[PDB]
Design a protein around this nucleic acid. Structure first.
Ligand SMILES: Nc1ccn([C@H]2C[C@H](O)[C@@H](COP(=O)(O)OP(=O)(O)OP(=O)(O)O)O2)c(=O)n1
Ligand SMILES: [Mg+2]
Ligand SMILES: [Mg+2]
Lengths: 548, 392
DNA sequence: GGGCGGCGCCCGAACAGGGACTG
DNA sequence: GTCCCTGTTCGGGCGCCG
């Protein structure tokens, strides 16, 4: 039937008119499917025959419905979508099985012909004109598939339709993805079935049928890409492409399946694979796998060959997130309540900043996990982290930004997160003092880096194709190279000071990485700043040196 | 009877995605919004309205009541008693409820749309829009002002030594009475309204130079850096004789004895840093900028300026020393204290340059917020230089 | 084979803000 | 101002759901 719910008023964007687009050639198979669909829709008033008073058209097609021998009618409304008003999407996220609680009784219902059961605004119907070619012209009186307004209008209409049932039945849980309903209740199987009949009769009153073919009554329930057993849930199998020559399209498919997988498979890593896509120009381009990517992919394959499940949420217990470090700024995590029973898993790998270290990355991973936990369970978890309370305290003292981790507890699973070197707060007695500088010429791109020391040493290196900042960093690198285990360095560069003060252990800059090697090898470093070009200290001397 | 309100020309309404809320906040929002719907203050709407502003809720201390908070910063973007800062005590009453007694221009309602989320996305968002003057909207005090003046006229007549200032949802009531009589008069005003700060004791944080009787090359280098920077605020500062002691290429820990000239230069400079900053005039057409620096050990410095190096105010906030402290909680309370000061002094909120990561802030700041307004802010990664310059 | 919305990931292009620089 | 460096956003591919 067609829902007697009120329509949602819809307008075109000002000054725009309906689309006028020739219809495509289609196969005879698609023509037969379309006419079988359209004869029946026209009988039911879901579509209306139109005449020459309607000067609009949009091309149509069909595709096999993904898990059936039935067809789906779709319209290429790209022009109409360009010309249709804006909506506010009401679907804010995707429900996750790890957020479901234990229920006595569970049902899964699909609404039959979901969009085609929800009326479309009268005034707008005329712009939905289409043509079924020969071997007939129509307009939609219901929501079409391919129009940008149909998801939001459907999701909102379904919410309105279910509100009276929810008000009457507060303690029956209805997870509502588009027309999928997961219905859970704390009733015996008998009273539950009775309430599900009440719900199907309520939906049918509002024009929505629930065909038995998609009425799931017994576990395991197929829902949202998952298998829901009574006390555990799993993912429907992941199949990774197994090719020999890889293209950017294949790689994106692999990385997408692996990301999807990482929600219940622990240990998934996609860094080297994702790095393959760096300089690409098109989806068709072929990329040879690096040895690193090859080996990472084999590891992921081994991980996926293993049987794994999640569990459901008990509100009367704490949420615990546990984090493990992989290399290259890659982290996995596991959220659980009881020791070896994961609610879910995850990975964080985002590279934030030219220069960083593992304490910053771990703080970002904590933040991500906290926001994700708020979305799924509505509260924050307690943390198990591989970082000493002492390490964290040191960082949080020395660091100039506000930073904070919620309730947490050390875990002794290597690799532990550490700070790899610490700058002194006070200058070092008996360490030689290097005054460093760099200058670069903006026209020719030639530069000098250099130092002068208080014990008489002076060195200048010349550089090609360089910049001011790079010569400052290069001078600091030269001083680290040519000093002993303890060294005072004086710089005029806010740039370099800010970088090194923040204690990076990784950088996209080769030069900063070389500096970091040096700073980890040293025993004590002290980095002081003076303002440039004020005739201060040995800064004047090394400045006169590196200008020429 | 309604009052038409328009948007600034060339501007559409806000389209701001709602952020995730905790279960307690969603439950409070749903109960509050249900009552507000029963009373006609808000109406359910659909996705054909393309506008949205985020919403959350705060639980006031010493109270199990939640108060809803709509972040109208964008919408507000798109639409003074100088004796209040001198009063012995100042109480801050919440009069937002009054606004729900006045209807909102129909053509404007669409711009106040907001969406309530759900745990684990059990349902799509539930969308509402306002039928009355909403709390937290710039236009609410403006349109209600005349009714407010009529409400407060006789209380102001009977108490002329009391200063009543209105900012967005708040009344500031200032008095020189003793604390008990002040609270008595405040409850008198609460009774009348059915038709605790102490600003006289706020402190400027001057820039301070180190005092010692043995200086090293490093000490003098640090002092010359600090004075060179400070001379952009105070032109009286001079560094010739102090930097003269640094000639050559010396060891950082070499002890340098100060000359007579440089000692005079240092004493004259530390005097100069006491004088007030010259030529600083508040412009109401520009916005206040507030910078905050984490000094460590629960200490925070802040500067309110409008043009660079022309500080209208410079202060510090202190808090619990570092046993179980929360940097973000403290940064948030510092933001609220600074905003309160700025509202009282100039009647306007500052735009904060916050020394925190965007994500850390947005993850946690709503757990410690207790005000009914929200200032604008941007996020910053400062060099430790300004930190040292304002440090103590 | 193609159309739509949501969320996720990763990458790069566009743009903004602040420091250093030339005569 | 210009050149440089760095951070944010937004749009494009793919994954997943319907
Ligand atoms: N590839 C897809 C899958 C779904 N949908 C939209 C339109 C569908 O009508 C709705 C729900 O998906 P279904 O597969 O349940 O479609 P129907 O409800 O029309 O079919 P059925 O009666 O077989 O359930 O989501 C879509 O636009 N494109
Ligand atoms: Mg269906
Ligand atoms: Mg230099």
């Amino acid at each position: 039937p067609i829902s007697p719910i009120e329509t949602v008023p819809v307008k075109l964007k000002p000054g725009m008119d309906g689309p006028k687009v020739k219809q495509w050639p289609l196969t005879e198979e698609k023509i037969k499917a379309l006419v079988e669909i359209c004869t029946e829709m026209e009988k039911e008033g879901k579509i209306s025959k139109i005449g020459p008073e309607n000067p609009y058209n949009t091309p149509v097609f069909a595709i096999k419905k993904k898990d059936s021998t039935k067809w789906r009618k779709l319209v290429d409304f790209r022009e109409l979508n360009k010309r249709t008003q804006d909506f506010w999407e009401v679907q804010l996220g995707i429900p996750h099985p790890a957020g479901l609680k234990k229920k006595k009784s569970v049902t899964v219902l699909d609404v039959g012909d979901a969009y085609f059961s929800v009326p479309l605004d009268e005034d707008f119907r005329k712009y939905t004109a289409f043509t079924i070619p020969s071997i007939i012209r129509y307009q939609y009186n219901v929501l079409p598939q391919g129009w940008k307004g149909s998801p939001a209008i459907f999701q909102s209409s379904m919410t309105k339709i279910l509100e009276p049932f929810r008000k009457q039945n507060p303690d029956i849980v209805i997870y509502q993805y588009m027309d999928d309903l997961y219905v859970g209740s704390d009733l015996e199987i008998g009273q539950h079935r009775t309430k599900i009949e009440e719900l199907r009769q309520h939906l049918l009153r509002w024009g929505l049928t629930t065909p038995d073919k998609k009425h799931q009554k017994e576990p395991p329930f197929l829902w949202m890409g998952y298998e829901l057993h009574p006390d555990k849930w799993t993912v429907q199998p992941i199949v990774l492409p197994e090719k020999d020559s890889w293209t950017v399209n294949d790689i994106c498919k692999l990385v997408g399946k692996l990301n999807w997988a990482s929600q219940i498979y622990p240990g998934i890593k996609v860094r080297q694979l994702s790095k393959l896509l760096r300089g690409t120009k098109a989806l068709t381009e072929v990329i040879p796998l690096t040895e690193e990517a090859e080996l990472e992919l084999a590891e992921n394959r081994e991980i996926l060959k293993e049987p794994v499940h999640g569990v459901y949420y008990d509100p009367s217990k704490d949420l615990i997130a546990e984090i493990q470090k992989q290399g290259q700024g890659q982290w996995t995590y596991q959220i659980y309540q009881e020791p070896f029973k994961n609610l879910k898993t995850g990975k964080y790998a985002r590279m934030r900043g030219a220069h960083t270290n593992d304490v910053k990355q771990l703080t970002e991973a904590v933040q991500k996990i906290t926001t994700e936990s708020i979305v799924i369970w509505g509260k924050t978890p307690k943390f198990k982290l591989p970082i000493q309370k002492e390490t964290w305290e040191t960082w949080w003292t020395e660091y100039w930004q506000a930073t904070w981790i919620p309730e947490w507890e050390f875990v002794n699973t290597p690799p532990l997160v550490k700070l790899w070197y610490q700058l002194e707060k006070e200058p070092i007695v008996g360490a030689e003092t290097f005054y460093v500088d760099g200058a670069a010429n903006r026209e020719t791109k030639l530069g000098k880096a250099g130092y002068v020391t208080n014990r008489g040493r002076q060195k200048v290196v010349t550089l090609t194709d360089t910049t001011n900042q790079k010569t400052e960093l290069q001078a600091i690198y030269l001083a680290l190279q040519d000093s002993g285990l303890e060294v005072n360095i004086v710089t005029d560069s806010q740039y370099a000071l800010g970088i090194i003060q923040a204690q990076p252990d990784q950088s996209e800059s080769e030069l900063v990485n070389q500096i970091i090697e040096q700073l980890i090898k040293k025993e004590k470093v002290y980095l002081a700043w003076v303002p440039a070009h004020k005739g201060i200290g040995g800064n004047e001397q090394v400045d006169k040196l590196v200008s020429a | 009877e309604t009052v038409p309100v328009k948007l600034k020309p060339g501007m559409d309404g806000p389209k701001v995605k709602q952020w995730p809320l905790t279960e307690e906040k969603i439950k409070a929002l749903v109960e509050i919004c249900t009552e507000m719907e029963k009373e006609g203050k808000i109406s359910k709407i659909g996705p054909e309205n393309p506008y949205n502003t985020p919403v959350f809720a705060i639980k006031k201390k010493d109270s199990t009541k939640w108060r809803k908070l709509v972040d109208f910063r964008e919408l507000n973007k798109r639409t003074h008693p100088a004796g209040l800062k001198k009063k012995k005590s100042v109480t801050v009453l919440d009069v937002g409820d009054a606004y729900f007694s006045v209807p909102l221009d129909e053509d404007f309602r669409k711009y106040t749309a907001f969406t309530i989320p759900s745990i684990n996305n059990e349902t799509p968002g539930i969308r509402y829009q306002y039928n009355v003057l909403p709390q937290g909207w710039k236009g609410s005090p403006a349109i209600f002002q005349s009714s407010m003046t009529k409400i407060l006229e006789p209380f102001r007549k009977q108490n002329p030594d009391i200063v009543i200032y209105q900012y967005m949802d708040d009344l500031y009531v200032g008095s020189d009475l003793e604390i008990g009589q002040h609270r008595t008069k405040i409850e008198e005003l609460r009774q009348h309204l059915l038709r605790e700060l102490h600003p006289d004791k706020w402190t400027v944080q001057p820039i301070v130079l180190p005092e010692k009787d043995s200086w090293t090359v490093n000490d003098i280098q640090k002092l010359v850096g600090k004075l060179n920077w400070a001379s952009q605020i105070y032109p009286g500062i001079k560094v010739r004789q102090l930097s003269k002691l640094l000639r050559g290429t010396k060891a950082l820990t070499e002890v340098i004895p100060l000359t007579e000239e440089a000692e005079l230069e240092l004493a004259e400079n530390r005097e100069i840093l006491k004088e007030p900053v010259h030529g600083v005039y508040y412009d109401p057409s520009k916005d206040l900028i507030a910078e905050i620096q984490k000094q460590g050990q629960g200490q925070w410095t802040y500067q309110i300026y409008q043009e660079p190096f022309k500080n209208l105010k410079t202060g510090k906030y202190a808090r619990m020393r570092g046993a179980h402290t929360n940097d973000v909680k403290q940064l948030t309370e510092a933001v609220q204290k600074i905003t309160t000061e700025s509202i009282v002094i100039w009647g306007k909120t500052p735009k904060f340059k916050l020394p925190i990561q965007k994500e850390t802030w947005e993850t946690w700041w709503t757990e410690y917020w207790q005000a009914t307004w929200i200032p604008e802010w941007e996020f910053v990664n400062t060099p430790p230089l300004v930190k040292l310059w304002y440090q103590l």
